[PDB]
Amino acid sequence: LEARALPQVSAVAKPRACSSYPTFDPATGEATEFIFYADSTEEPVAPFAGSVVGKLANPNLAIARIGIAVRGDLAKVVTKCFPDGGEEGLRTRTHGDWRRLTLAGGEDENIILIGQGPVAHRPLTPHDHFFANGTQQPGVFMGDNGSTTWAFSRKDASASEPFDQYEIRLLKSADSPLRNGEFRGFVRAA
């Protein structure tokens, strides 16, 4: 289990709507609370390791960022799809409200921002996964621009953040450059 090679998949974008998520509620038009999970990681990651609110190195980018906890039983922040906004965007319950999730965009630090201001950026999009023979890999995988492969950077507990976590960013392509200590994986919503 020391190093599992990444499954070669093709990601097909689903509609940015609550009906693309496995907790779809036709009664309310939204999807009930779900978690972002690490998936198919190159190094072993504890199962059920889910969403956590991490701090930004640049505090002026947004409120915070979404990471993946190391411990599988650490407290998880919940995310919902809200039909609000004409379109349909994801929102995480943190800092006293449901706050929008966005992607910073770009190559080096395409991260999931929480509560970003009126700045240009990219939408966090759900995807289907298909293997080379057309068989579907089960799950809803997050990404953008044809890419659903994320880089995981372990950041151990500090005085400000008393928990271990993986800092995640979206890779441009499959062969996008990795930084020191980073391994690849997917982010599944369930």
Closest CA to 52 of 20, 92, 17: 92
Question: Quick one: CA dihedral 161, 118, 107, 3, positive or negative?
Answer: positive
Task: Give Cα separations from 95 to 44, 63, 91, 112, 150 (angstroms).
Answer: 31, 9, 12, 16, 25
CA 180 to chain CA centroid, Å, is 20
* Helix, strand counts (H, E) of the chain: 0, 14
Question: Quick one: CA dihedral 11, 107, 151, 190, positive or negative?
Answer: negative
Rounded CA separation 171/70 (Å): 20
Characterise 160 by phi-psi region: left (phi > 0), alpha (psi -120 to 50), beta (else): alpha
Q: 90 and 80 in contact (C-beta within 8 Å)?
A: yes
The structure's method of determination equals: X-ray
Give the chain's radius of gyration (CA, Å): 16
Question: Quick one: CA dihedral 121, 62, 144, 178, positive or negative?
Answer: positive
Q: 137 and 7 in contact (C-beta within 8 Å)?
A: yes
Q: Resolution of the coordinates in A? A: 2.5
Residue linked to tokens 């599988």: 72
Instruction: Report residue 15: phi and psi, to 5°.
Output: -60, 140
As a residue count, the chain comes to 190
Residue 173 makes CB contacts below 8 A (sequence gap 6+) with: 147
120: number of Cβ within 10 Å: 8
Beta bridge partners of 54: 65
Helix/strand/coil for 34:
strand
Instruction: Report residue 86: phi and psi, to 5°.
Output: 70, -60
Residue 57 makes CB contacts below 8 A (sequence gap 6+) with: none
Residue 126 makes CB contacts below 8 A (sequence gap 6+) with: 13, 14, 16, 20, 21, 140, 141, 142, 189
Q: What domains are defined for the chain?
A: 10-189 (2.80.10)
Question: Quick one: CA dihedral 168, 76, 140, 1, positive or negative?
Answer: positive
Q: 40 and 142 in contact (C-beta within 8 Å)?
A: no
Alpha helix (H) residue ranges in the chain: none
